[PDB]
């Protein structure tokens, strides 16, 4: 459960991201594929090489979705309803993978936000990404 402090913290950190949101999404994906190679099994159609437009493209879509979640942080389940249906019934990615991409997003943020990534903010962002994950996997069975 996010507390108001958590929400505050996420809105601030994500705001400093701004227009780079898509760029970070892409770097997180690339970090995930190199660090946790089993995650490539979920993108067998993608060119996964460094600089891949497919990767950059998909990174932008992930980032835009997170941007929407932060805006609708009090009502994420209806806000992400199309995504959660799509993940549960079409994509069917294994749920452990969500934890991996989340760790990688956190690493990406930390590498870009020296000043804003304090322990408190790190804790809120971890809870935030865990809630998103939980929403995205809520309709799997």
């Amino acid at each position: 459960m996010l507390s108001p402090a958590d929400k505050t913290n996420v809105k601030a950190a994500w705001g400093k991201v701004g227009a780079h949101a898509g760029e970070y999404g892409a770097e997180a994906l690339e970090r995930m594929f190199l660090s946790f190679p089993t995650t490539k099994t979920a993108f067998p159609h993608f060119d996964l090489s460094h600089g891949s437009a497919q990767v950059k493209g998909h990174g932008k879509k992930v980032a835009d979705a997170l941007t929407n979640a932060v805006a609708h942080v009090d009502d994420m389940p209806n806000a992400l309803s199309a995504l959660s249906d799509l993940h549960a019934h079409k994509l069917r990615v294994d749920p452990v993978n969500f934890k991996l991409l989340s760790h990688c997003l956190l690493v990406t943020l930390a590498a870009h936000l020296p000043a804003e990534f304090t322990p408190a903010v790190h804790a809120s962002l971890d809870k935030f990404l865990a809630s998103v994950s939980t929403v995205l996997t809520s309709k799997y069975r």
Binding site: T38, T41, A42, D94, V96, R141
Partner: protein, 146 residues
Amino acid sequence: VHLTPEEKSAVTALWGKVNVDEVGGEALGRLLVVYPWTQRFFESFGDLSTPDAVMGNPKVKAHGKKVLGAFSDGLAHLDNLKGTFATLSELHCDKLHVDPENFRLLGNVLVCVLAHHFGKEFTPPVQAAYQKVVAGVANALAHKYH
């Protein structure tokens, strides 16, 4: 995998009573039922929309026999699972694109199925030994992923 000779014997003695054909279909079928997202790899098999459809599907039953027959061979070589499953590991990574978490889930479903089949004979120590086996098989099947 490190099992004791008393664990190895307990494993082999029970397995001799298993009809791998029956058990294989039941294990694969339950996997698809309990954990619906695994159905993604089996679209070519036809209808898997309900439990009855899954458990009745002849391709699921046939596939389960292959998987468990391959598991059964691996029990003869507990000391070198890596070697026995090397080709299969590469196949599951490079051709089938199967997330190795699925091997773990299947392992756990198999243990439930053995417990169901054998009842009180599937004692805590026997279960412990099969948990080591199933983890060993999953790690061996994941070893060539890259």
